[PDB]
Design a protein around this motif. Structure first.
Motif, short mmCIF file in Angstrom:
data_model
loop_
_atom_site.label_atom_id
_atom_site.label_comp_id
_atom_site.label_asym_id
_atom_site.label_seq_id
_atom_site.Cartn_x
_atom_site.Cartn_y
_atom_site.Cartn_z
N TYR A 144 -10.88 6.41 5.77
CA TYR A 144 -11.52 6.32 7.07
C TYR A 144 -11.87 7.73 7.51
O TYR A 144 -10.99 8.60 7.53
N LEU A 161 -10.45 -2.07 6.95
CA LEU A 161 -10.80 -2.15 8.36
C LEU A 161 -12.20 -1.56 8.56
O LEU A 161 -12.80 -1.00 7.65
N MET A 166 0.84 -1.19 0.00
CA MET A 166 0.00 0.00 0.00
C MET A 166 0.88 1.24 0.00
O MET A 166 1.77 1.38 0.84
N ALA A 167 0.62 2.14 -0.94
CA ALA A 167 1.34 3.40 -1.03
C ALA A 167 0.56 4.51 -0.34
O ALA A 167 -0.65 4.41 -0.15
N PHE A 168 1.27 5.56 0.03
CA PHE A 168 0.62 6.73 0.58
C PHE A 168 -0.25 7.38 -0.49
O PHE A 168 0.04 7.27 -1.69
N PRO A 169 -1.34 8.04 -0.10
CA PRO A 169 -2.08 8.86 -1.07
C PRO A 169 -1.16 9.88 -1.70
O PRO A 169 -0.43 10.60 -1.01
N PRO A 223 -8.08 9.94 3.19
CA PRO A 223 -7.47 8.77 2.56
C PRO A 223 -6.34 8.19 3.40
O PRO A 223 -5.50 8.92 3.93
N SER A 224 -6.33 6.86 3.50
CA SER A 224 -5.30 6.13 4.24
C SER A 224 -4.20 5.59 3.34
O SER A 224 -3.02 5.63 3.72
N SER A 247 -3.68 8.88 -6.91
CA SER A 247 -4.96 8.96 -6.22
C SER A 247 -5.45 10.39 -6.02
O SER A 247 -6.54 10.57 -5.46
N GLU A 304 -8.76 11.66 -4.16
CA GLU A 304 -8.59 12.26 -2.84
C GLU A 304 -9.46 13.49 -2.66
O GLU A 304 -10.01 13.72 -1.58
N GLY A 364 -5.40 1.75 10.55
CA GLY A 364 -6.27 2.67 9.82
C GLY A 364 -5.87 4.13 9.86
O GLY A 364 -6.75 4.99 9.78
N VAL A 365 -4.57 4.43 9.97
CA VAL A 365 -4.12 5.82 10.04
C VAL A 365 -4.31 6.48 8.68
O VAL A 365 -4.01 5.90 7.63
N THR A 366 -4.83 7.71 8.70
CA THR A 366 -5.15 8.45 7.48
C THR A 366 -4.41 9.78 7.45
O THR A 366 -3.78 10.20 8.42
N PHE A 367 -4.52 10.46 6.30
CA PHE A 367 -3.84 11.73 6.08
C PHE A 367 -4.73 12.70 5.30
O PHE A 367 -4.62 12.82 4.08
N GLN A 426 -1.14 -0.10 8.61
CA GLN A 426 -2.18 -0.73 7.79
C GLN A 426 -3.16 -1.53 8.64
O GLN A 426 -4.35 -1.59 8.32
N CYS A 427 -2.69 -2.14 9.73
CA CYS A 427 -3.55 -2.86 10.65
C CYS A 427 -4.12 -1.97 11.75
O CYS A 427 -4.46 -2.46 12.84
N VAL A 442 -3.35 3.76 -0.99
CA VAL A 442 -3.81 3.34 -2.30
C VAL A 442 -3.11 2.03 -2.67
O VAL A 442 -1.91 1.86 -2.41
N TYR A 443 -3.88 1.10 -3.23
CA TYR A 443 -3.31 -0.17 -3.68
C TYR A 443 -4.13 -0.68 -4.86
O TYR A 443 -5.22 -0.19 -5.14
#
Ligand SMILES: Nc1cncc(Br)c1
Ligand SMILES: Nc1cncc(Br)c1
Ligand SMILES: [Cl-]
Ligand code: NA
Lengths: 305, 301
Positions: free
Chosen positions: B118, B141, A6-9, B122-123, B10, B14, A302-305, A299-300, B125-126
């Motif tokens: 969440y 989640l 999984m990459a950052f937005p 945005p958390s 993304s 976003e 749910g941290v967001t930005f 990832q386990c 992208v995959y």
């Protein structure tokens, strides 16, 4: 549930990518405040690149030799200078889309997101790890130079990588955003090759914790080990030495899963010596080493930005 | 060179994620022009989990029961309607960051990027693919409902998936942006199980062509196969049947590498027979099926 590479937005970084042209060469630049950053080798011809004298090549260039486009708008270059292997082009307008950012140099084994661009236009984002041999296993074609790597901590983008070159084995080499190369590489056409690579041990252990969290437990066993004894096994299978700092960093995952790090090291020991016996871990028949402990926790959780 | 599971940038998506609150439930919504799209199960209570009557639950709601937060700004809901399993909330502000977009329903085997979100932020992208059993193997989640899947063709965002629930096997089910579920699933907590999953054969063949393009040939052989003999072998390994459509679609990659499609099918038959024998293909010890022929051409050459 689920675990994915999984990459950052990438939105905050997409707004900083521009096209830089010098002569017949066009590549990507990073536009932050009123400076566009790009590889200094944009000013070399094919012949220059065999043995470049970059200060000499640069003094012959004027500001108007650097064509910079942000989307469809042209940017006016009012100054140019070198810092290590990156060219800095002072432009007449600050980037209104500049995020909160820092320039950081990362360590081997740490991961980051790569925003692949071509002609200043972002085309894809993927997750990379700086290998112990200071290369990255990226996916780049001609015109990708100047694409950047980054992390996001809170709202601040940490720029850590700028793409410069592809090595004969198909792996990639670049600098931090201050122009310092990762690894023993130089920006010129000469005999260069990546050194023998090793596996990032703390990252494999983090990924085994991610597997346990996701219900994949067949590799757990009753045994435990010592740091000394595991590192003899790690050396034998071309794994990085596991330091006490790595065990401390895996502390949270050890308590969350009830499996101590040296308890997990016994699982990894047995996997290295016996294989996976036809089974898979998180859908992989290889031991994945491009997830840091921080990646697994984030990832386990749910941290967001 | 190189080959990576690569998602689309993304940023355009976003700028469309918002937070949708109803009662005690909070999930994500997709804000396009003056409409916010979100799963209709945001209006269920703890009682409405097994047999919700969505029309009855929705008729009891007024506009101000829906709280929509875009960043730090509250959007004013001025209308609401239901289309299949998505709620469409009219808001009093058009999203200024609305990209060029369209809604497309994808077929099994198609890939797309997922922007996991969440609370409207945005958390990560995959890349994902629609499995033949109409689920996706995602990373989701609690609170990720309303996260969307998408492709970006040129500068047009093709919205193709919105996340609704996770099945007991840890895989995920959702709808297109018209609210129609992919597969036989429903937005009820009643017992539901995904069908036996199969490997996307056309995607594995495309991925083997990608390996040849990047200079790897060890898995080829001197043999060929008829289409029917290949399918008779492949479904013994739980592989999807390969159709003539799939053979046509592989045409450009066959021409670029000089390996006829049925010659690559014979190589795949032998890989299924032999395994890798300690070798890897593009860095995997498994045969990868989440790269489409379109993906390979976009990333390679
Ligand atoms: N210029 C360039 C950078 N990376 C990879 C390739 Br292929 C070309
Ligand atoms: N609501 C929800 C959606 N996806 C995954 C999980 Br676990 C929960
Ligand atoms: Cl499709
Ligand atoms: Na153990």
């Amino acid at each position: 549930s689920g675990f994915r590479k999984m990459a950052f937005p990438s939105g905050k970084v997409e707004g900083c990518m521009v096209q830089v042209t010098c002569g017949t060469t066009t590549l990507n630049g990073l536009w932050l405040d009123d400076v566009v950053y790009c590889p200094r080798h944009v000013i070399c011809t094919s012949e220059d690149m065999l043995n470049p004298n970059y200060e000499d090549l640069l003094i012959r260039k004027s500001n108007h030799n650097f064509l910079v486009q942000a989307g469809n708008v042209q940017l006016r270059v009012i100054g140019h200078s070198m810092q290590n292997c990156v060219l800095k082009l002072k432009v007449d307008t600050a980037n209104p889309k500049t995020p909160k950012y820092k320039f950081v140099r990362i360590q081997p084994g740490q991961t980051f997101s790569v925003l692949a661009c071509y002609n200043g236009s972002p085309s894809g984002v993927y997750q990379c790890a700086m290998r112990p041999n200071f290369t990255i296993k990226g996916s780049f074609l001609n015109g990708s130079c100047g694409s950047v790597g980054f992390n996001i901590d809170y709202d601040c983008v940490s720029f850590c990588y700028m793409h410069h070159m592809e090595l004969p084995t198909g792996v990639h080499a670049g600098t931090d955003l201050e122009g310092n190369f990762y690894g023993p590489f130089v920006d010129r056409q000469t005999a260069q090759a990546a050194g023998t690579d090793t596996t990032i041990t703390v990252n494999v252990l983090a990924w085994l914790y991610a597997a346990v969290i996701n219900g994949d437990r067949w590799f757990l066993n009753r045994f435990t080990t010592t740091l000394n004894d595991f590192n003899l096994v790690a050396m034998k299978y071309n794994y990085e030495p596991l330091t006490q700092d790595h065990v401390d960093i895996l502390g949270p995952l050890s308590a969350q899963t009830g499996i101590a790090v040296l308890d997990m090291c016994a699982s990894l020991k047995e996997l290295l010596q016996n294989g996976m016996n036809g089974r898979t871990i998180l859908g992989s028949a290889l031991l994945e080493d491009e997830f840091t402990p921080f990646d697994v926790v984030r990832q386990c959780s749910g941290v967001t930005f």
